Scaffold this active site. Sequence first.
Site, PDB file in Angstrom:
ATOM      1  N   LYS A   1      10.534   2.992  -0.929  1.00  0.00           N
ATOM      2  CA  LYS A   1       9.838   4.277  -1.029  1.00  0.00           C
ATOM      3  C   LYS A   1       9.132   4.605   0.276  1.00  0.00           C
ATOM      4  O   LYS A   1       9.170   5.731   0.726  1.00  0.00           O
ATOM      5  CB  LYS A   1       8.803   4.304  -2.159  1.00  0.00           C
ATOM      6  CG  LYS A   1       9.357   4.221  -3.573  1.00  0.00           C
ATOM      7  CD  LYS A   1       8.219   4.369  -4.611  1.00  0.00           C
ATOM      8  CE  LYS A   1       7.164   3.312  -4.535  1.00  0.00           C
ATOM      9  NZ  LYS A   1       7.491   2.190  -5.453  1.00  0.00           N
TER      10      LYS A   1
ATOM     11  N   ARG B   1       3.599   6.485 -11.910  1.00  0.00           N
ATOM     12  CA  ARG B   1       4.156   5.172 -12.188  1.00  0.00           C
ATOM     13  C   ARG B   1       4.225   4.903 -13.684  1.00  0.00           C
ATOM     14  O   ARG B   1       4.844   3.918 -14.091  1.00  0.00           O
ATOM     15  CB  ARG B   1       3.230   4.122 -11.565  1.00  0.00           C
ATOM     16  CG  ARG B   1       3.919   2.996 -10.965  1.00  0.00           C
ATOM     17  CD  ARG B   1       2.972   2.271 -10.061  1.00  0.00           C
ATOM     18  NE  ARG B   1       3.055   2.671  -8.655  1.00  0.00           N
ATOM     19  CZ  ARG B   1       3.569   1.910  -7.691  1.00  0.00           C
ATOM     20  NH1 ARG B   1       4.087   0.713  -7.957  1.00  0.00           N
ATOM     21  NH2 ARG B   1       3.541   2.332  -6.455  1.00  0.00           N
TER      22      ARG B   1
ATOM     23  N   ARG C   1       9.074  -8.703   4.220  1.00  0.00           N
ATOM     24  CA  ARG C   1       8.363  -7.596   4.851  1.00  0.00           C
ATOM     25  C   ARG C   1       7.265  -8.015   5.835  1.00  0.00           C
ATOM     26  O   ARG C   1       6.462  -8.893   5.545  1.00  0.00           O
ATOM     27  CB  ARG C   1       7.766  -6.676   3.776  1.00  0.00           C
ATOM     28  CG  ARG C   1       7.041  -5.524   4.431  1.00  0.00           C
ATOM     29  CD  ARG C   1       6.650  -4.450   3.511  1.00  0.00           C
ATOM     30  NE  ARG C   1       5.952  -4.937   2.333  1.00  0.00           N
ATOM     31  CZ  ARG C   1       5.645  -4.127   1.337  1.00  0.00           C
ATOM     32  NH1 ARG C   1       5.943  -2.819   1.440  1.00  0.00           N
ATOM     33  NH2 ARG C   1       5.055  -4.599   0.257  1.00  0.00           N
TER      34      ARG C   1
ATOM     35  N   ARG D   1       1.780  -8.624   3.771  1.00  0.00           N
ATOM     36  CA  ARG D   1       0.882  -8.031   2.777  1.00  0.00           C
ATOM     37  C   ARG D   1       0.448  -9.100   1.786  1.00  0.00           C
ATOM     38  O   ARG D   1       1.243  -9.970   1.399  1.00  0.00           O
ATOM     39  CB  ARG D   1       1.557  -6.848   2.086  1.00  0.00           C
ATOM     40  CG  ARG D   1       0.670  -5.609   2.049  1.00  0.00           C
ATOM     41  CD  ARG D   1       1.435  -4.353   1.606  1.00  0.00           C
ATOM     42  NE  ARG D   1       1.683  -4.353   0.154  1.00  0.00           N
ATOM     43  CZ  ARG D   1       2.337  -3.387  -0.476  1.00  0.00           C
ATOM     44  NH1 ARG D   1       2.798  -2.360   0.224  1.00  0.00           N
ATOM     45  NH2 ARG D   1       2.546  -3.454  -1.794  1.00  0.00           N
TER      46      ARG D   1
ATOM     47  N   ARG E   1       4.238  -7.990 -10.115  1.00  0.00           N
ATOM     48  CA  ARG E   1       4.495  -6.583  -9.794  1.00  0.00           C
ATOM     49  C   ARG E   1       5.841  -6.106 -10.368  1.00  0.00           C
ATOM     50  O   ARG E   1       5.949  -5.008 -10.904  1.00  0.00           O
ATOM     51  CB  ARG E   1       4.466  -6.345  -8.291  1.00  0.00           C
ATOM     52  CG  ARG E   1       3.093  -6.603  -7.675  1.00  0.00           C
ATOM     53  CD  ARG E   1       3.156  -6.819  -6.191  1.00  0.00           C
ATOM     54  NE  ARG E   1       3.837  -5.726  -5.496  1.00  0.00           N
ATOM     55  CZ  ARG E   1       4.300  -5.817  -4.251  1.00  0.00           C
ATOM     56  NH1 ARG E   1       4.175  -6.954  -3.563  1.00  0.00           N
ATOM     57  NH2 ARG E   1       4.909  -4.774  -3.703  1.00  0.00           N
TER      58      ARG E   1
HETATM   59  N1  LIG Z   1      17.674  -0.014   2.650  1.00  0.00           N
HETATM   60  C1  LIG Z   1      17.052  -1.157   3.001  1.00  0.00           C
HETATM   61  N2  LIG Z   1      17.740  -2.288   3.259  1.00  0.00           N
HETATM   62  C2  LIG Z   1      17.114  -3.411   3.618  1.00  0.00           C
HETATM   63  N3  LIG Z   1      15.791  -3.490   3.716  1.00  0.00           N
HETATM   64  C3  LIG Z   1      15.051  -2.380   3.456  1.00  0.00           C
HETATM   65  C4  LIG Z   1      15.657  -1.190   3.094  1.00  0.00           C
HETATM   66  N4  LIG Z   1      14.697  -0.276   2.901  1.00  0.00           N
HETATM   67  C5  LIG Z   1      13.529  -0.883   3.126  1.00  0.00           C
HETATM   68  N5  LIG Z   1      13.737  -2.166   3.480  1.00  0.00           N
HETATM   69  C6  LIG Z   1      12.760  -3.221   3.803  1.00  0.00           C
HETATM   70  O1  LIG Z   1      12.244  -3.686   2.530  1.00  0.00           O
HETATM   71  C7  LIG Z   1      10.815  -3.916   2.617  1.00  0.00           C
HETATM   72  C8  LIG Z   1      10.030  -2.967   1.682  1.00  0.00           C
HETATM   73  O2  LIG Z   1      10.281  -1.565   2.000  1.00  0.00           O
HETATM   74  P1  LIG Z   1       9.195  -0.480   1.726  1.00  0.00           P
HETATM   75  O3  LIG Z   1       9.781   0.852   2.090  1.00  0.00           O
HETATM   76  O4  LIG Z   1       7.908  -0.921   2.298  1.00  0.00           O
HETATM   77  O5  LIG Z   1       9.249  -0.549   0.139  1.00  0.00           O
HETATM   78  P2  LIG Z   1       8.326   0.166  -0.924  1.00  0.00           P
HETATM   79  O6  LIG Z   1       9.219   0.653  -1.999  1.00  0.00           O
HETATM   80  O7  LIG Z   1       7.389   1.117  -0.276  1.00  0.00           O
HETATM   81  O8  LIG Z   1       7.532  -1.120  -1.436  1.00  0.00           O
HETATM   82  P3  LIG Z   1       5.961  -1.320  -1.818  1.00  0.00           P
HETATM   83  O9  LIG Z   1       5.769  -2.754  -1.916  1.00  0.00           O
HETATM   84  O10 LIG Z   1       5.079  -0.520  -0.956  1.00  0.00           O
HETATM   85  O11 LIG Z   1       6.021  -0.723  -3.249  1.00  0.00           O
HETATM   86  P4  LIG Z   1       5.065  -0.966  -4.442  1.00  0.00           P
HETATM   87  O12 LIG Z   1       5.288   0.211  -5.307  1.00  0.00           O
HETATM   88  O13 LIG Z   1       5.261  -2.355  -4.963  1.00  0.00           O
HETATM   89  O14 LIG Z   1       3.571  -1.033  -3.813  1.00  0.00           O
HETATM   90  P5  LIG Z   1       2.578   0.212  -3.459  1.00  0.00           P
HETATM   91  O15 LIG Z   1       2.021  -0.081  -2.146  1.00  0.00           O
HETATM   92  O16 LIG Z   1       3.226   1.495  -3.733  1.00  0.00           O
HETATM   93  O17 LIG Z   1       1.365  -0.066  -4.520  1.00  0.00           O
HETATM   94  C9  LIG Z   1       0.521  -1.175  -4.285  1.00  0.00           C
HETATM   95  C10 LIG Z   1      -0.313  -1.393  -5.552  1.00  0.00           C
HETATM   96  O18 LIG Z   1      -1.158  -0.261  -5.801  1.00  0.00           O
HETATM   97  C11 LIG Z   1      -1.265  -0.047  -7.214  1.00  0.00           C
HETATM   98  N6  LIG Z   1      -0.678   1.305  -7.472  1.00  0.00           N
HETATM   99  C12 LIG Z   1      -0.011   2.072  -6.614  1.00  0.00           C
HETATM  100  N7  LIG Z   1       0.349   3.222  -7.217  1.00  0.00           N
HETATM  101  C13 LIG Z   1      -0.158   3.184  -8.459  1.00  0.00           C
HETATM  102  C14 LIG Z   1      -0.135   4.069  -9.540  1.00  0.00           C
HETATM  103  N8  LIG Z   1       0.489   5.242  -9.466  1.00  0.00           N
HETATM  104  N9  LIG Z   1      -0.774   3.677 -10.658  1.00  0.00           N
HETATM  105  C15 LIG Z   1      -1.401   2.519 -10.761  1.00  0.00           C
HETATM  106  N10 LIG Z   1      -1.418   1.638  -9.773  1.00  0.00           N
HETATM  107  C16 LIG Z   1      -0.816   1.981  -8.613  1.00  0.00           C
HETATM  108  C17 LIG Z   1      -0.527  -1.208  -7.896  1.00  0.00           C
HETATM  109  O19 LIG Z   1      -1.436  -2.325  -8.046  1.00  0.00           O
HETATM  110  C18 LIG Z   1       0.528  -1.516  -6.836  1.00  0.00           C
HETATM  111  O20 LIG Z   1       1.045  -2.849  -6.986  1.00  0.00           O
HETATM  112  C19 LIG Z   1      10.418  -3.620   4.055  1.00  0.00           C
HETATM  113  O21 LIG Z   1      10.345  -4.895   4.684  1.00  0.00           O
HETATM  114  C20 LIG Z   1      11.552  -2.764   4.609  1.00  0.00           C
HETATM  115  O22 LIG Z   1      11.763  -3.024   5.998  1.00  0.00           O
HETATM  116 MG   LIG Z   2       5.104   1.602   0.102  1.00  0.00          MG
END
Ligand SMILES: Nc1ncnc2c1ncn2[C@@H]1O[C@H](COP(=O)(O)OP(=O)(O)OP(=O)(O)OP(=O)(O)OP(=O)(O)OC[C@H]2O[C@@H](n3cnc4c(N)ncnc43)[C@H](O)[C@@H]2O)[C@@H](O)[C@H]1O
Ligand SMILES: [Mg+2]
Length: 216
Positions: free
Chosen positions: A13, A88, A127, A160, A171
Amino acid sequence: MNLVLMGLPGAGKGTQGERIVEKYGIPHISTGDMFRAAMKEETPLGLEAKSYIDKGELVPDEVTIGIVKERLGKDDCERGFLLDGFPRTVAQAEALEEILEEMGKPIDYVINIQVDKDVLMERLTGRRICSVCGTTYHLVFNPPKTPGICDKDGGELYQRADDNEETVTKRLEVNMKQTAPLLDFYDEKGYLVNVNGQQDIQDVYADLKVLLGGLK
Ligand SMILES: Nc1ncnc2c1ncn2[C@@H]1O[C@H](COP(=O)(O)OP(=O)(O)OP(=O)(O)OP(=O)(O)OP(=O)(O)OC[C@H]2O[C@@H](n3cnc4c(N)ncnc43)[C@H](O)[C@@H]2O)[C@@H](O)[C@H]1O
Ligand SMILES: [Mg+2]
Ligand SMILES: [Zn+2]
């Protein structure tokens, strides 16, 4: 151009969202980034979110919806927005529906970036993020020139705090649990699109452009 990105943890994402807003003139609104910035800065929002985030649990809906509602009211959202990782849950989606109805800004696409759960541990544990500029790498899939060092400003890369096996496993469970109900919710609305996230970054983005051009 009013968009939601969804996907299981590590599906891409942030990677796709950054590319989208570079090209299309809309703000990138990531709830994860918002919470982590609050945590970094030790704000009251950060202190509340931290106990959930550190465990890999979802932050409760009430505050999460609150911070998004306030964010979407800003002038920079007048021509669209990219919500990343929100909604989410079905409850979050229902709350957002009402929010966007009154703004006259209903969702154009909910983009589900589809990636097999089986490859997501590897995406997350590999990552790496720059301590200085926040640029994201992957040890194998998108590596820096020098391991551990950012290409842009030479910053040290870090992992992270939630990208370890135990917390990733939590997660994935937590988010999986909310996934099928949310996909069903949006599919019934008619504007869920699934995109294949298991391709090179450039190729996922190319597929995304073909859909998003209709909203340019
Ligand atoms: N095509 C490809 N091929 C190969 N490699 C690739 C690739 N594309 C990307 N990559 C690689 O893969 C890796 C990841 O890519 P990356 O693009 O960073 O992936 P991502 O989908 O953004 O992963 P996140 O870990 O940020 O998602 P998440 O939803 O778990 O955590 P968030 O921060 O949103 O949320 C954090 C926390 O906040 C809370 N939270 C956030 N939103 C909410 C909500 N709406 N409600 C309640 N809690 C929430 C929760 O506690 C949550 O756990 C990178 O190393 C990249 O280089
Ligand atoms: Mg992200
Ligand atoms: Zn850097």
